């Protein structure tokens, strides 16, 4: 057999991110001990990422490409800190914020940059305050103990509802993955011959083998549904 | 007549730097003359508009010109146009005047306890 | 060419001054006959590969 | 398809003259295939023992080295 397209993404020659026109890494300023006001100089769109970024100035002018909540405008004053009040814009630690509210770009570790809840039209919800660890629900469903000192932007991330509209033409998806990375178009494994992929070969196109494989299964062998505790139509539940 | 004319410079291709225009000489011969590049010249920060009272030439040949024609006379002469400078005066006055009146306020309010 | 480098031009010089008939007086001196100049060529037939 | 027509656009040069070898210096990869420049050691293998002795000592002038052979004749004769 040959090495399979799933294995070949590691070696990373043509399968690298197209990172040329990307404006910078989206994160907070570092922590550095109250309250600090910060004007939104402008809000710009970087390629690949569906969200906007908003370039702040903590005037020297110290810059920070923070990811943009919805309802931010140019020449708003954003207020990072503990004793900053509640507006959509402001960047509070999880000690201060009320529970049962939608927050954006929340950090895992303090002073980190921002980790959970970054893509367009997403938000971490806050469940409740234990003592040190403010428990929050992530967009998927999963729940996470996160320390109260670490920061999070208030409100929902901008650019919501982009997949509501379908892309009618193959050309629209060509321009989508030009900004991101080469991973498209996908040739299906059944169509390929036996050497190229596991599902390939045979007189008539069909999978033949069970098509559902363990965590223990090797490189080359992990193809199709990996460790699928259910399959088929998820009716109810 | 044959009015066709060669490129003189040894670059073949039709890039932005290698562009030509046909011109009649003194000798009745058509010939390539090469186009110098366009310049936008100084726009402003805030809004993004053309300031007046300066030519769009190259900034290198802006040095060769007189110090008069490089600038506008006001404070923030080149960088900011007129009405944006008016707004900076009004705000930077009344930000400082409110802060100065705050020092008058916290002087005046605390004196009520003594009397 | 044009736009040759200098050390490219050095090789093309040496390749054309070496290209000539053998002199008459060596056959008169040594008395050997049938010696050809090895670094003779023609431009059209054999390329240099330098 | 793969023959005469596709020989047409063959104008770029893969290899260029090499400083140490002077002979096949790879422009993109920057290495002399024949001699291994710029590795400080000079390339030879025992599977090409024929091709090595074309390059190796004796082939050139030996300006310093021939006079040091000639001393050792005189001392032992």
């Amino acid at each position: 057999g040959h090495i399979v397209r799933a294995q070949r993404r590691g070696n990373g020659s043509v399968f690298q991110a197209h990172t040329h026109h990307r404006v910078g890494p989206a994160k907070f300023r570092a922590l550095d001990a109250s309250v600090i006001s910060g004007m939104v100089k402008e809000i710009i769109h970087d390629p690949g990422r569906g969200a906007p970024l908003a370039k702040l100035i903590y005037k020297g002018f110290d810059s920070a490409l923070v990811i943009a909540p919805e309802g931010i405008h140019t020449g708003q004053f954003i207020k990072c800190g503990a004793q900053a009040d509640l507006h959509i814009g402001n960047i509070l630690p999880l000690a201060q914020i009320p529970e049962g509210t939608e927050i954006c770009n929340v950090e895992h570790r303090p002073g980190d940059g921002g980790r959970y809840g970054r893509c367009s039209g997403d938000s971490c919800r806050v469940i409740g305050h234990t003592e040190n660890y403010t428990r929050i629900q992530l967009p998927s469903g999963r729940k996470a103990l996160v320390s109260n000192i670490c920061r999070a932007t208030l409100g929902i991330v901008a650019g919501g509802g982009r997949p509501e509209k379908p892309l009618l033409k193959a050309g629209n998806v060509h321009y989508k993955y030009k900004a991101k990375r080469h991973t498209w178009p996908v040739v299906c494994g059944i169509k390929m011959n036996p050497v190229d992929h596991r599902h390939g070969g045979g007189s008539h196109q069909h999978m033949g083998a069970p098509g559902t494989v363990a965590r223990s299964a090797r490189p080359g062998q992990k193809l199709g549904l990996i460790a699928s505790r259910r399959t088929g139509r998820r009716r109810g539940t | 007549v044959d009015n066709r004319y060669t490129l003189r410079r040894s670059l073949g291709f039709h890039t932005i730097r290698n562009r030509v225009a046909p011109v009649r000489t003194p000798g009745n011969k058509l010939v390539a003359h090469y186009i110098a590049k366009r310049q936008n010249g100084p726009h402003c920060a805030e809004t993004g508009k053309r300031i007046n009272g300066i030519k769009c030439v190259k900034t290198c040949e802006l040095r060769r010109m007189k110090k008069n024609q490089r600038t506008v006379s006001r404070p923030y002469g080149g960088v900011y146009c007129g009405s944006v400078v008016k707004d900076r005066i009004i705000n930077a006055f009344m930000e400082e005047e409110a802060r100065a009146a705050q020092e008058r306020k916290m002087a005046n309010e605390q004196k009520k306890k003594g009397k | 060419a044009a736009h040759k480098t200098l050390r490219t031009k050095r090789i093309l010089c040496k390749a054309m001054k070496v290209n000539r008939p053998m002199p008459q007086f060596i056959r008169q001196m040594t008395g050997v006959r049938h010696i050809r100049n090895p670094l003779t060529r023609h431009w059209r037939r054999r390329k240099m590969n330098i | 398809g793969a023959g005469t027509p596709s020989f047409g656009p063959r104008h770029n040069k893969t290899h260029t003259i090499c400083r140490r070898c002077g002979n096949c210096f790879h422009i993109q990869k920057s290495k002399c295939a024949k001699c291994g420049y710029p590795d400080a050691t000079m390339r030879h293998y025992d599977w090409e023992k024929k091709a090595h002795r074309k390059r190796a000592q004796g082939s050139g002038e030996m300006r310093h080295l021939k006079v040091t052979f000639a001393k050792l004749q005189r001392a032992y004769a």
Binding site: - | - | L6, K9, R10, L12, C13, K14, M16, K17 | -
Partner: protein
Amino acid sequence: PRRPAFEHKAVKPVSLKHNDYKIIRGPVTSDKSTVKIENENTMTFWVDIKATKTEIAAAFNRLYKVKPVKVCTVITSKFVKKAYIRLPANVEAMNIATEIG
């Protein structure tokens, strides 16, 4: 700062070596150079391949006692340098060429 305990290379060379006489090799004998002497008042010479126009202008002056106006510098298909040296208006290029012969 550095200061060695002895000279390393003690022996200085005997003469200049890179001389005025060995910059300018000698004049070129062609039909083109014959016209440029008579018409334009402009000599021609074979030159050292590393010699600059600043080196040639000074070296031409020291030998023949005439300061040149311009020097323009070919490297030929024979890979030796050719220097078109324009003399000034007062001197004639035939009169300098007759001295050399």
